[PDB]
Amino acid sequence: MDLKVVVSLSSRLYTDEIAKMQQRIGCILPLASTHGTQNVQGLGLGQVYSLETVPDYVSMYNYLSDCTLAVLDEVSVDSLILTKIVPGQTYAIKNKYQPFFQWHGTGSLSVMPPVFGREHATVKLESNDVDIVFPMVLPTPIAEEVLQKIL
Amino acid sequence: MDLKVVVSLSSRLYTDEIAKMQQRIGCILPLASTHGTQNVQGLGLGQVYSLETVPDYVSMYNYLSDCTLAVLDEVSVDSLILTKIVPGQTYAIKNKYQPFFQWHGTGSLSVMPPVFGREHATVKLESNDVDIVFPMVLPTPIAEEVLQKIL
Amino acid sequence: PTIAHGDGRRPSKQRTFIVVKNCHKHHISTEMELSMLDLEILHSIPETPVEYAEYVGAVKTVASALQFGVDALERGLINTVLSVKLRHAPPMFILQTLA
Amino acid sequence: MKVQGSVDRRRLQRRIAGLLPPPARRLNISRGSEFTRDVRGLVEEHAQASSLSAAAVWRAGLLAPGEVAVAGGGSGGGSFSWSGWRPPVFGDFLIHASSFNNAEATGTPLFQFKQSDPFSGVDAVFTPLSLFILMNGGLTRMANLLYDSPATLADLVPDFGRLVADRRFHNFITPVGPLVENIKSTYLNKITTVVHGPVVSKAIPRSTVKVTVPQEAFVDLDAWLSLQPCPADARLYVALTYEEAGPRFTFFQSSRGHCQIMNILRIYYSPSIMHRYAVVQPLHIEELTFGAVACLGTFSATDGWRRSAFNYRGSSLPVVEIDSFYSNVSDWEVIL
């Protein structure tokens, strides 16, 4: 099959914002809708996680369990090029996340809701008055360990 | 690839019950053996659920997982045409069930024996003296709750 | 028809009978298994003659594995027709005093 | 009025002609024809292999846009699926030559065990007989013929006496799967295995590949238990069991399903649970955990278990062989 996701915007991005997402060129985002054409309000965790809201764990985990994943391919002026995650398909993932964790071959990658700092999680888009919030991706044993220890 | 199920009736069904089976069109039921030709005794959940016996829902709910699942396509007096469910194929399904609980993407659909009622979920076939017990499908939290209630 | 009689017996009228009969259906299914390697190398062309010998062995295999299915379908034909004859065959001692 | 801002009319026919056709099914046979090229459209499995020459590769279609190789150039690529066929994922390991016995049945399942040192470049892996030697029919005799000097295994795991007590030995091991290719070097052997898909030989002389298990480790879960349903797939399971003699490693096959499989595991290990729980060992907090279960994948039901001899250095061992295996590793679940 052919997968394509292209997000257009309302306003053009500032120069500072471009390199911010260039740092995060290959990584994972949950995508609310499944169509080839989609607006910015469905590609982050901004709908579930917000500064004004009081954040919750279990609703966020339910949203990550019910949503579709995607991996960024290309960041340009105003165009975001994402490719959909499909069951039974190979993908390539670069490991750009602010809390740093070593990755190993033959390990188990698990996506957990990002518990660390806002500056560890998100990139603010001041052009469109929005944020993109990235699910922290961790190996499954450490995903157990961090969870139980902060609990 | 070409999942095709046709189940042959030994004798023609009565002019009443052909209408009732047409009312049951588009419904999941589990079948016995993964073959294009099946006898009606293997078809449906009839044989293990007896009116004479005290119902064990755990026995039914074990038995249904053992069967491969299928969807009814064409009702005729001579034979029943059904398509089958492979684990890695995507299917169009229509909710025609009489209790009508609203469905959402939030839950995976779960298939249960008809815990609610006995008679209305089943169709008798006195032309070929066997009973068809259609399963009841429900979303995830209602299914979890009903299993909890039973235990 | 009926035949008139001089007796005082009341007449039986003109008699009409209407009988309805319908089809009965039969389904016949065979299963065949084909190996991966045969069906793969059928598409592959012979580069060297030992691969050509593997090719002709492959096409002989798939030809026999197709003749098996078609001949078993003819056996399905004859089995179903003989069964239909036997389903409507009452035994002799019942039928003889009915004749 | 004929502005025609859309480019759809008279262009998109050419693109829909490519993007349209479905893979064929339900083709009919006439006894008079009985063998045609139209049949051969469906008959061919349409292989992926190399002739190392440019035009032959253009013919065979390895330079395909999709994952699975499609010949035909632009006429190829319209398959749009192959019943959900997946290419096999291959895993490349680099092992010391002493940990891995060079003679191997080419289908035995492997297991990776992690090592503590940071920023390393090498890793360990194991076969089940190496695991039996490390844990401490003619299974022990065959293992003694295959392996000598257990010390070369014991340095790779510096925590084993502690792991069998802290009950954590199971979760470090991740199951991998059967072999595909072995390349012999004196210092460092090159091992290539298969994960998540068809177990397929990459050797260009084509061969049918089968995963093999020693019969002593394997117990048929369906055999000793009891118009039942038969689903087309049964599953294979590993069970690693903490006993007073030591850790023990077993294999189970059943088509029943998970919650049934946990019960049949429990009523299987009930005498060993009785003995190990007995009087020799009272209690401590880490000691409560008993067994671990992981799924290795789906196997064709009704095919069964092909029993064969394994001959090495003039000795024989009974080995079961499994045809047409599909690999799918799951996580570890605790059983007690």
Swiss-Prot record, chains A, B:
| Molecular functions (GO terms) | structural molecule activity
Residue spans making up a coiled coil are: none
Q: Where is the protein found, in the record's own terms?
A: Virion; Host nucleus
Q: Which span of the entire protein is present here?
A: 1 to 151 of 301
Q: What exactly does this protein do?
A: Structural component of the T=16 icosahedral capsid. The capsid is composed of pentamers and hexamers of major capsid protein/MCP, which are linked together by heterotrimers called triplexes. These triplexes are formed by a single molecule of triplex protein 1/TRX1 and two copies of triplex protein 2/TRX2. Additionally, TRX1 is required for efficient transport of TRX2 to the nucleus, which is the site of capsid assembly.
Write down any Gene Ontology CC term: viral capsid
Q: Which UniProt keywords apply?
A: Capsid protein, Host nucleus, Virion
**UniProt source species:** Epstein-Barr virus (strain B95-8)
Family indicated by similarity: Belongs to the herpesviridae TRX2 protein family.
- Specify the protein name: Triplex capsid protein 2
Self-association and partners: Interacts with TRX1 and major capisd protein/MCP.
Swiss-Prot record, chain C:
Record's function text: Self-assembles to form an icosahedral capsid with a T=16 symmetry, about 200 nm in diameter, and consisting of 150 hexons and 12 pentons (total of 162 capsomers). Hexons form the edges and faces of the capsid and are each composed of six MCP molecules. In contrast, one penton is found at each of the 12 vertices. Eleven of the pentons are MCP pentamers, while the last vertex is occupied by the portal complex.
Q: What family classification does the UniProt entry report for this protein?
A: Belongs to the herpesviridae major capsid protein family.
Subunit info? Homomultimer. Makes the hexons and eleven out of twelve pentons. Interacts with triplex proteins 1/TRX1 and 2/TRX2; adjacent capsomers are linked together in groups of three by triplexes, heterotrimeric complexes composed of one molecule of TRX1 and two molecules of TRX2. Interacts with scaffold protein; this interaction allows efficient MCP transport to the host nucleus. Interacts with capsid vertex component 2/CVC2. Interacts with the small capsomere-interacting protein/SCP.
- Put simply, this protein is called Major capsid protein
Location in the cell reads: Virion; Host nucleus
State start and end of the fragment within the whole protein: 100 to 198 of 1381
Curated annotation (Swiss-Prot), chain D:
Question: Where in or outside the cell is it found?
Answer: Virion; Host nucleus
Q: Kindly indicate whether the keyword Repeat belongs to this entry.
A: no
Would the keyword Lipid biosynthesis be found if you checked this record's keyword annotation? no
**UniProt-listed Pfam families:** Herpes_VP19C
Q: Name one GO molecular function term.
A: DNA binding
A Gene Ontology cellular component where this protein is annotated is: viral capsid
Name the keywords, alphabetized.
Capsid protein, Host nucleus, Virion
Give the signal sequence positions.
Answer: none
Question: InterPro entries recorded for this chain?
Answer: Herpes_1
Q: Which GO terms describe its biological process?
A: viral capsid assembly
Q: What does this protein do?
A: Structural component of the T=16 icosahedral capsid. The capsid is composed of pentamers and hexamers of major capsid protein/MCP, which are linked together by heterotrimers called triplexes. These triplexes are formed by a single molecule of triplex protein 1/TRX1 and two copies of triplex protein 2/TRX2. Additionally, TRX1 is required for efficient transport of TRX2 to the nucleus, which is the site of capsid assembly.
User: Can you state the subunit structure given in the record?
Assistant: Interacts with TRX2, MCP and capsid vertex component 2/CVC2.
> What family name appears in the similarity comment?
Belongs to the herpesviridae TRX1 protein family.
The molecule here is called Triplex capsid protein 1
Source organism (scientific name)? Epstein-Barr virus (strain B95-8) (HHV-4)
